[PDB]
Design a protein around this ligand. Structure first.
Ligand SMILES: [Au+]
Length: 68
Protein backbone atom coordinates (compact mmCIF):
# COMPACT_ATOMS: atom_id res chain seq x y z
CA UNK A 1 0.00 0.00 0.00
CA UNK A 2 1.78 3.14 -1.19
CA UNK A 3 1.48 6.33 -3.29
CA UNK A 4 -1.88 5.70 -5.01
CA UNK A 5 -3.69 4.70 -1.82
CA UNK A 6 -2.25 7.69 0.02
CA UNK A 7 -3.43 10.03 -2.72
CA UNK A 8 -7.00 8.71 -2.65
CA UNK A 9 -7.13 8.72 1.15
CA UNK A 10 -5.87 12.30 1.51
CA UNK A 11 -7.49 14.03 -1.46
CA UNK A 12 -10.81 12.19 -1.65
CA UNK A 13 -11.10 12.41 2.13
CA UNK A 14 -12.09 8.76 2.51
CA UNK A 15 -11.01 5.84 4.68
CA UNK A 16 -7.90 3.90 3.68
CA UNK A 17 -9.90 0.69 3.38
CA UNK A 18 -11.91 2.03 0.48
CA UNK A 19 -8.90 3.75 -1.05
CA UNK A 20 -7.41 0.26 -1.08
CA UNK A 21 -10.48 -1.09 -2.90
CA UNK A 22 -10.10 1.60 -5.57
CA UNK A 23 -6.55 0.45 -6.32
CA UNK A 24 -7.61 -3.22 -6.31
CA UNK A 25 -10.30 -2.27 -8.84
CA UNK A 26 -7.63 -0.83 -11.12
CA UNK A 27 -7.71 2.90 -10.32
CA UNK A 28 -4.49 4.79 -9.61
CA UNK A 29 -4.91 8.53 -10.25
CA UNK A 30 -7.22 11.41 -9.39
CA UNK A 31 -7.69 12.08 -13.12
CA UNK A 32 -9.44 8.71 -13.44
CA UNK A 33 -11.74 9.29 -10.48
CA UNK A 34 -12.63 12.73 -11.80
CA UNK A 35 -13.10 12.06 -15.52
CA UNK A 36 -13.78 8.39 -16.28
CA UNK A 37 -17.45 7.73 -17.20
CA UNK A 38 -19.63 7.20 -14.13
CA UNK A 39 -20.96 3.88 -15.41
CA UNK A 40 -17.46 2.52 -14.88
CA UNK A 41 -17.08 3.77 -11.31
CA UNK A 42 -20.55 2.42 -10.55
CA UNK A 43 -19.18 -1.07 -11.21
CA UNK A 44 -17.13 -1.20 -8.01
CA UNK A 45 -18.64 -2.77 -4.89
CA UNK A 46 -19.77 -0.30 -2.26
CA UNK A 47 -20.42 2.66 -4.53
CA UNK A 48 -23.74 4.22 -5.43
CA UNK A 49 -24.23 7.27 -7.64
CA UNK A 50 -24.48 10.02 -5.01
CA UNK A 51 -21.18 8.90 -3.49
CA UNK A 52 -19.55 8.58 -6.90
CA UNK A 53 -20.53 12.17 -7.72
CA UNK A 54 -19.14 13.37 -4.40
CA UNK A 55 -15.84 11.59 -5.00
CA UNK A 56 -15.61 13.01 -8.53
CA UNK A 57 -16.12 16.54 -7.20
CA UNK A 58 -13.43 15.98 -4.59
CA UNK A 59 -11.08 14.55 -7.21
CA UNK A 60 -11.62 17.65 -9.37
CA UNK A 61 -11.02 20.03 -6.48
CA UNK A 62 -7.89 18.06 -5.55
CA UNK A 63 -6.46 18.36 -9.06
CA UNK A 64 -6.96 22.14 -9.04
CA UNK A 65 -5.30 22.35 -5.62
CA UNK A 66 -2.33 20.19 -6.61
CA UNK A 67 -1.81 22.22 -9.80
CA UNK A 68 -1.00 25.14 -7.48
AU1 LIG B 1 -23.74 0.15 -2.60
Amino acid sequence: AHAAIDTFTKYLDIDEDFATVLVEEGFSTLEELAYVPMKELLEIEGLDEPTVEALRERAKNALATIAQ
